Amino acid sequence: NLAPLPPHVPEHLVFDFDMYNPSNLSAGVQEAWAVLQESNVPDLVWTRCNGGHWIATRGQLIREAYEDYRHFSSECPFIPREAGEAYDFIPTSMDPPEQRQFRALANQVVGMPVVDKLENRIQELACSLIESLRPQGQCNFTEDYAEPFPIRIFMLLAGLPEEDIPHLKYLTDQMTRPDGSMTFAEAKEALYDYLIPIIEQRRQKPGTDAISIVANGQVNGRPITSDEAKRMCGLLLVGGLDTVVNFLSFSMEFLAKSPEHRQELIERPERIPAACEELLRRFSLVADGRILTSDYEFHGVQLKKGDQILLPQMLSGLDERENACPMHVDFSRQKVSHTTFGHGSHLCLGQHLARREIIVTLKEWLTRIPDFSIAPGAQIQHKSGIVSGVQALPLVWDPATTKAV
Ligand code: HEM
Structure with a gap:
């Protein structure tokens, strides 16, 4: 279903890419998106899918657009427009x-000092989760670790019950990887229906949790409104429940296929931080955009006010002009360049928490289960969207080769 080409779009700039269902998805989601960087594709193209929008395919352009909020506004960051509009x-x-x-307020709840204080908790849960799995000799990484580990840590930080995870998770997934079950507006309403009562309570009887902190925060001298707190917690929910969760699976899927990279991290632990950055580059998974505030000529192309443009944070580090042999994972790259956590004034505030969770997982997993692989016959399937993910990840290993710690 392609939308009619707008008058100002030159047909030689047309490239019908569907961000929710790319063509080469079977080859891997990152590989599927990388077709946008083939020689036959211009740096800036227009796709008729999902209503019609521009897509910047090079790291240089993506960074420029993200730095220039005057022309590219965050008011409508999601595609399709209906989603970007309901997005608040x-x-x-x-x-x-x-x-x-x-x-500034949001940084108060997920910033560095908070991560420092939760460090022991993150480590305890990771160790506890892995030790419990270790003797089984198999698991579905996505549901057995990738989801519980980061999500439980977030629920702990937010002071929300673990019983609401299945409900909250479903709503979040509908916003990043629309099932078709419900519209963005409806998914957002549902999420807000959940938060509203809680914020009300936290306003009267404040706690030390992230929500209590946000609900009673001060913004510009004055106090934050109920509506404002609601809209901020909504974002915190999506970030805590649908980012690290998916990233861990991409990474683990790769480690399960590359014994050499596992060995490297086991023998030279001082490389883990670097490996973390390289994996964040190779398995980048976020892609949202901006909206043009006025007519603007960008790198020779005429953009019209109201035009939406997808600036795939995932593409920057895969761009060969930025990183040689982009698809190759090399822990000793002299320079790992990416914009996986964004660029410009909207740089991810939860990246410190994310990096901590990733590093702890790698260290603690490889310590107890150094040898593992993907279950024979399993076909790993990726899903594309604002945040890409992995359907399931069946892993197997010989318990006899594991190490209790
Ligand atoms: C691997 C994990 C993650 C990735 C790749 C990621 C990526 C991003 C990206 C690309 C943006 C910028 C979006 C834009 O410019 O429109 C962003 C913003 C943000 N992220 Fe993350 N994120 C991750 C984890 C988290 C976590 C754990 C939280 C905490 C709940 C979170 C909280 C935030 C916040 C608060 C913002 C908004 C900052 C602002 O607009 O000023 N993120 N993230």
């Missing part, structure tokens, strides 16, 4: 200088 999360749906005040 703070601070992502705001442009500076407005964004700055809310960003």
Whole structure:
């Protein structure tokens, strides 16, 4: 279903890429998106799928657009338009200088100092989860570790019950990888229906949890409104439940297929931090965009006010002009360049937490289960969207080769 080409779009710039269902998906989601960087594809193209929008395919252009909020506004960051319009999360749906005040508050709840204080908890849960799996000799990584590990840590930080995870998770997934079961507006309403009562309570009887902190925070001298707190917690929910969760699976899927890379990390632990950056580059998974605030000629192409443009954070590090042999995983790259956590004023505030969770997982897993592989016959399937993911990841190993710690 392609949308009619708008008058200002030159047909030689047309390339019908569907971000929710790319063509070479079977080859891997990152590989599927990388077709946009083939020699036959211009740096800036227009796709008629999902309503019609531009797509910047090079790291240089993606960075430029993200730095220039004057022309590319965050007001409508999601494609399709209906999604971008129903999208009202703070601070992502705001442009500076407005964004700055809310960003400061959000940093208060997921910033570095918070990660430092939760460190022992993150480590305890990781060790506990892995030790429990170790003797089984098999598991579905996605549901057995990738989901429980990061999500339980977030629920702990947010002070929310573990019983609500299945419900909250489903709603979140509908926003990043639409099933077709419900519209973005409906999924958002549902999520807000959940948060509203909680924020109300946390406003009267404040706690030490992230929500209590946000609900009673101060913005620009004055206090945050109920509506504002609601829209910020909504974003925190999506970030805590659908980012690290998917990234861990891409990484584990790769480690299960490359004994050499596992060995490398086991023998030279001082390389884990670097390996983390390289994996964040190779398995980048986020792709959202901006909306043109006015007519603007960008790198020779005429963009029209109201035009939406997808700026795939995932593509920057896969661009060969940025990283030689982009598809190759090399832990000793002299320079790992990517924009996996974003670029510009909207740089991910939860990246410190994410990096901590990734590093702990790699270290603690490889310590107890150094040898593992993908279950014979299993076909790993990826899913594309605002945040890409893995359907399932069946793993198997010989318990006799594991190490209890
Ligand atoms: C591998 C994990 C993650 C990735 C790749 C990731 C990626 C991103 C990206 C690309 C943006 C910018 C979006 C834009 O410019 O429109 C962003 C923003 C943000 N992320 Fe993350 N994120 C991750 C984990 C998290 C976590 C764990 C949280 C915490 C709940 C979170 C909280 C935030 C916040 C608060 C923002 C908005 C910042 C602002 O608009 O000023 N993220 N993230």
